[PDB]
Symmetry: C3
Subunit: 654 residues, 3 copies
Amino acid sequence: QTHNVVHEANGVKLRETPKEFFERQPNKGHIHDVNQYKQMYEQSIKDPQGFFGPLAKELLSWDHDFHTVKSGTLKNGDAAWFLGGELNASYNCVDRHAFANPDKPALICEADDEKDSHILTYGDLLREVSKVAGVLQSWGIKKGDTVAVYLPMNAQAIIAMLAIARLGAAHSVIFAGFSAGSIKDRVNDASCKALITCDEGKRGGRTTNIKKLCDEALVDCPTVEKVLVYKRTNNPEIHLTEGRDYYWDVETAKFPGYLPPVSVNSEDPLFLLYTSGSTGTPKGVVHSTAGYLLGAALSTKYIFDIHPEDILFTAGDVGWITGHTYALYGPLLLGVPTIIFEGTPAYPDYGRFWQIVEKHKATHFYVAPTALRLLRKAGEQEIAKYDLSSLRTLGSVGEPISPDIWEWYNEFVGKNQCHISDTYWQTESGSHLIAPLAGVVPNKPGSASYPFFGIDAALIDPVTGVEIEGNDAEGVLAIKDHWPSMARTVYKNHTKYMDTYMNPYPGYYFTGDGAARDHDGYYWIRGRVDDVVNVSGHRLSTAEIEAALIEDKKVSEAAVVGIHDDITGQAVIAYVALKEGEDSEGLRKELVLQVRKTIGPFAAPKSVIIVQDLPKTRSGKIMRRILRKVSSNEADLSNPQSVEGIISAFGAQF
Amino acid sequence: QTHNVVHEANGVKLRETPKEFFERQPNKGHIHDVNQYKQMYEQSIKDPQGFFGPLAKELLSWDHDFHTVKSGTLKNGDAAWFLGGELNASYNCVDRHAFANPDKPALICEADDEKDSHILTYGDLLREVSKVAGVLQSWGIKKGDTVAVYLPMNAQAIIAMLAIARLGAAHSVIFAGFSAGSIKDRVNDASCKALITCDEGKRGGRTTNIKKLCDEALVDCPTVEKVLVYKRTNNPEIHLTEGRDYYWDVETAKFPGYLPPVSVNSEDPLFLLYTSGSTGTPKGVVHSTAGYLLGAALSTKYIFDIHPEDILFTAGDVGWITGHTYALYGPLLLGVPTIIFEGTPAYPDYGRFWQIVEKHKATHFYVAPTALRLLRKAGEQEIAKYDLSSLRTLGSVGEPISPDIWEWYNEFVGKNQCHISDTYWQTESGSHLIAPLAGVVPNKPGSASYPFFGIDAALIDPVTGVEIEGNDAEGVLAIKDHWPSMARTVYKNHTKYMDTYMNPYPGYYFTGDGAARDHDGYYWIRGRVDDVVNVSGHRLSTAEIEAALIEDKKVSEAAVVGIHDDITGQAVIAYVALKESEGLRKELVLQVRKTIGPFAAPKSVIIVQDLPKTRSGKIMRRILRKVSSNEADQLGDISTLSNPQSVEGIISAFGAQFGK
Amino acid sequence: QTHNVVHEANGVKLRETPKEFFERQPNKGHIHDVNQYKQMYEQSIKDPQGFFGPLAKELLSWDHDFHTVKSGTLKNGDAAWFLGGELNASYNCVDRHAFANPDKPALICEADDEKDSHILTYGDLLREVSKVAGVLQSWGIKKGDTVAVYLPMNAQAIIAMLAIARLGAAHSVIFAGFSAGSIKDRVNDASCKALITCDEGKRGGRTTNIKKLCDEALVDCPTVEKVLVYKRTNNPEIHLTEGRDYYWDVETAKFPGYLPPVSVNSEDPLFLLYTSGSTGTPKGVVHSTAGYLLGAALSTKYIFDIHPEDILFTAGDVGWITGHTYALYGPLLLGVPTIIFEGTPAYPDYGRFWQIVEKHKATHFYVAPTALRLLRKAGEQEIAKYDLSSLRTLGSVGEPISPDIWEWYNEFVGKNQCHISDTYWQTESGSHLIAPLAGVVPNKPGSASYPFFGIDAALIDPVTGVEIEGNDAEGVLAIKDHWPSMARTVYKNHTKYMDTYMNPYPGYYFTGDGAARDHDGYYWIRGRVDDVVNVSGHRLSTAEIEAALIEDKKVSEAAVVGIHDDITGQAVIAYVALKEGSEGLRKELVLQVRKTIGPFAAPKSVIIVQDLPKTRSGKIMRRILRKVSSNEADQLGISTLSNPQSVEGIISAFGAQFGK
Ligand SMILES: CC(C)OP(=O)(O)OC[C@H]1O[C@@H](n2cnc3c(N)ncnc32)[C@H](O)[C@@H]1O
Ligand SMILES: CC(C)OP(=O)(O)OC[C@H]1O[C@@H](n2cnc3c(N)ncnc32)[C@H](O)[C@@H]1O
Ligand SMILES: [Cl-]
Ligand SMILES: [Cl-]
Ligand SMILES: [Cl-]
């Protein structure tokens, strides 16, 4: 009854699913109780063929039937699911629903200014997707090509992604907050033949330069042959390169409202999504089609308890896996409307999220703890102004959610009447790994609870490398076998894929996360064990930010570390040592701007600390732990004298 | 029994199908009576999924089954049929028949000179199509490409179209009567990668310059990488560009007699066919595969009453939709022989058609009224010299058929023993829209009778735009929902497609024709309500002929209108205003022959000082039509003219110059 | 009981299958006796659709079902099998077995040095093939492309062929014994986009220059865009051209262990294999996919009596059809392990073959008579040192096997306990044509016995061209209808295909071989009737060797003929007439052939003469040269001799120069 290792679980009462949840449920739940889930989970692990086989035939529409459910091993890096099958993601996300009820809402597009909001039905979505795919097809985009998308979180982003997939091409979405440097690396790694973007962006009421950043990147992108440009603001001063750039509205008007979808294999790549690891250069994560789609449909249906009558509002961005899986593919596969919100939770006020939920009577809400911390700070009064009684499932993602934020989230938003789903997963996992199923799994505030279907979670002693038997344990979180939506490779760098996920603990998948398992079997995520920082739910690499600082030729060496931040959860502090050859305060700001243009404004360090030399080991490498403690005011060795200078530089410049 | 609006229907007795028709039928008819047709028609309109679903699985062979029969709406321009299905037109037209009876005749090629006539069995056609597709495939022609065909109406034209479609590419046939300019425009719009043509042509005994006109156009066609040239006359003086042009016989000898067909989606384009509308620039009409093929097979089977034992002789050209649907796809889909005639109805004599029918015992004849009027003038005596007792279905297409031509066609050709099927349809419709089913629907000479399966015809008041309820009515002819073989878009210009067909009357498909519906429900086609003239059965735009005359820099403005002609049915008179006499008229007529082609030349060019223009500024063509039709005394209204003095000059110029 | 024509058959007792064979069979045989085979053969000939239809569904896994079993005729050259079907060769040879037993042995790779031997399971093979196919796909290699392979007989050669086929591309394997000249002709004829090779080879303990020969040819190969190089020896002195050449291990490491296979049509080309005929230029023989694969599985299963528990050791090379069909496709289709041997039967000793058989308990052995003659001469004592009791089927291929070698093979290798299968077939047949089924057909030493399923063998009188009725007859060996694995065309040269195989005797397939049929129906292969020489089982063209000698401009004319050799069966003698040009020059010409074709095609002896026996027209009397070389220069049979005095110079030159 007492835990010696998993201290989070001591004195934590199980929080049942409120009765109001089952009152608001439109139909019978998909799973009755935890016991039924236990048996379903056991079958998903002991008998994947008998479990996912029928579920694949049920939830997905196939152009060609598969003959083998599961193939390959984790250790050999040859995992494959539903081999021999053929299908198309846009048909499963659009066509099959449009043919049934073409007037059912599909994309609920809430623009930055609500005066620009609109709704696309599945019939509308089919025609728009078909037109964009018709444009791309006429440009030579064929199966096996990759098409980059640099768009904000609006309806055009969803249309672009589905139009690319309709042709059998893989879309590589680039988060609109990246700079020309990040756009350049991603476009050239995938050798994209085309790019879809817009003239300008509207977020928080402020206009962003989108097309100018594209033009800036495309001078080093010889593979991009044509660019489709959407008139978001219709600014007449935005220049289009003659012979390369063409207008969305102009080109789509030349093509009809239906284009046949292209059948692809189950294991044909659906999309690339470049993620940051302890790598220095972002690596292109590649996901299959059938495996990924099932994971999106399966998790969305069961973890969130999504029914045909439901409305899902994932407050995320398609530039990250959360927008991919649970704003686009998850809900559209199940045929339900999905709310696509372009702006911020603060514009025009801090009741923007709740006005949207009330406006469309959304039944499911999915956001990162960073927004909850902000809205607790500056938006508690706005929540009571709106009717949130349509909600019954509330989800958290991207970051650890403190028990206190869990309570605030449950009370002030859920009114002690909704189920909270702390969903743990990764870009590489495609869909949820560990999460409490809505209406099934009781909560422990701050825990993700039980693994999901097909995930045989395990803890590994980092020192010995041996799987830890028994509960009340801590260690590195690993998966003992591959699952349908697991990422299949790193684009054209499968050795890096193997070295990162399969080789560190042979026979297992290495998540890069630490976690603990208590006597009840619940998993408590501890955080990353590598050089990855979670700034406001956005995965960042300390190595990537350091390399950005090094691009400024005024820097000799740089060291970036992550510290606790009470709003962004975790913040990046950059320690920079300059070479030989004025205005120290002015130079700090130069380095911050250096990161904003190399990676992007969101990856800027909170503070840049200029030092004389960095604390370096006897060998010569940087001990970041000294920087971590000094930065977090916990400052209690080839150069043991520098440590005093580090503390003073931080005390003065911070 | 009396009509106040549909005057054509007054005092017109129903003309039943002669008993000899049912005697000559090889088997039981496909539909018994009008009662069964009414019930089938009702289902095709109220339950398209339950009607066309089974018919598609029956008449067409599928590589992949379809999951949805019908999708999209007319108003949104997203019509789709048999979604999810995969098939191949050449497999449906050739292979499946070659596998059953490889020695059954497929193409009965009657050449211009009968000494060059021959017959291709379905087995022969498979070998030739596979060889031509093997050549094209080796040249890089893959699915999604377009291949142009500039060939006369002979067996090589048919092989090229099927070979292009066998690879999943869309063929764009260019009528052999077009000029280097017309070839140039069509090739560049579709961005064709290859071209199939021949060295020279034989039509009416006269040699035509085929390859020479291609070379003339191809200097401005940068997308065409290779050209396959057939030795029709084997004239050694015909030049081939090294590295670009290759010979049919030389290259096809390099490849085997079977090539796998390429599966395409139901809604993948089968072909482009550039048609003339009231737009000025020819637009590439695009047809799907499964939808179009079914429409061709369904209409050919039911409207013409085609059985496996029958032989069809469509006296048309693959350069137009009539040759597309009812000389190639219609009959070949059903597995029956099709007579491909290369020459003219007058060479070597005016009994050429009837000698062909007698030679092969053709059971079905399909021609335009223009030929009937010509043969009435100079070939009536020849008809009796030949045994035409094998015929039982006689078809008319392209033009309105006058009651007198209907009687002449029934008596001297059909011997008052055949069914006459006046088939109304368009390039954009793919197959028949309104026609009397052979052996089922009684005729009214000059009427097309009832709509066909899946066609919910309607009349719209041009002024109000409201559907006209009830009979004894006239107005714009519209279709209330899309049908399987309806054209799906205009190539790379879907906005023009929408603006032309779907937007004028939202919720409907706008045919561009006026028509009347009588108390019996029969439709009487009145003619085009837009600037389209039917010159010798070939659809033409007055805007194209006007633009052709204006290219001659001696012309300031031009206005072309269509009037009745007793031989060609409708002729174009061109009114030209110069910027400053017989010789200049001859220059302008030749100007049209070089821009469009010899077939589109105006009947007469009338030089005038200035044209009748309205208050707004547009050319009042109705005055030009009336003056040309010798009705320049019942001019309904000239008070709308900014220059009512021009009318005096228009009448005098026409009276003086029309004879000269 | 006595033969007047087939003298080989006189006094030849039927040699029954030893009882130990049926003891060693893992299960009941696939066919019980000759009577059951006779009935099955009758159905394969009288009802191919009912015979091969079910067998195709049984032995092959289909992505799409076929609708027609058989199509086309021999005379029209449009043969096709299993039309409409779709499948993939690598899925049938690798994936479907890896999914069942991923750890079952697939490739038993015996390297030249046994220290480098290893075993790839079906799971291992899927990962290796998937990675190489992933590399090739990234280079743009898509369906319809051809990829050349210049590798020795090791596991990488098998992987390369399967990786190419996985993408829907056709692999064109180039035997590693060719020189840059032969590589050039094959690569440029197929327009290969890529090439898979290695840096150097290990054969007989000697290092071979592989990549150096590629670089020499590739300077004249503009179509090859990239080259994948395998580190066989890891020699750092082997140069790779930057931008074209890439390393096997480096590139495959970038891609995952599974890649989806690409479905192809039954009649989509699986591979090219350039064979030498009486033409002068090697012709690219093209084989279908489904038809070829079925032939490989069917013959391997039934003629060799292959069961799931068996191990096959085909002592051949993938550079020839024997390695294609019965070292790669045959066994892997059936899911059994196949031994891939890189070296020679003499390194490190002449018991190398038998050590391999004992090491892996191989149940089936398949080799050419040339190796048997070599091992009889210098390795007879080694055979008894090894346990060969696991064998039960012994196969002969490529050459006629003398009755004496048949006895030695049966006794010293089979211990008078195994079935001998003298398999007669060709590159163009894909799989066996005439062979004694293991455990079914009794043997006549030196005979191939009865035709196999679907092979309607026949004899044709060369003079009359008429099929020979009755037995005890001799003539040209022909097949009366096409069979599933029959070659479908010559790459981009179907006219040569027709002229070589279908046109000589219309209605039949002309094998190019003479044969005799005795009173029991057994076929006795007599040999090639054209200018083809069988040097050590490798088909060679005399015209190709003559053209190589003529490239040396020191030669005026050359004439190559084949003579009896007691080890290689047949050896090539070259008679060369110089212009103004002795021992050193003979070595120049021998090296000249080694430079154009390859060391294996080098003449055994080069005889310099003043002039060749030439006809009045200008032809070389080759029949005189054959007899003179075989010391039969008195039974010359000679009316066309324009220079009957040259014959004396030919005889003297041969008697003097053949030694030194
Ligand atoms: C068939 C094909 C060659 O037509 P298009 O060249 O696409 O031109 C279509 C136009 O032709 C005219 N029309 C065709 N058929 C008939 C008919 N039976 N009775 C009366 N008018 C007919 C109509 O004006 C139609 O809109
Ligand atoms: C199998 C492969 C290596 O053959 P190719 O290299 O294509 O040459 C084919 C020619 O080889 C000869 N032949 C093959 N098998 C035998 C045999 N069993 N008995 C006698 N002659 C045989 C024949 O002259 C055949 O036409
Ligand atoms: Cl299954
Ligand atoms: Cl259906
Ligand atoms: Cl069958």
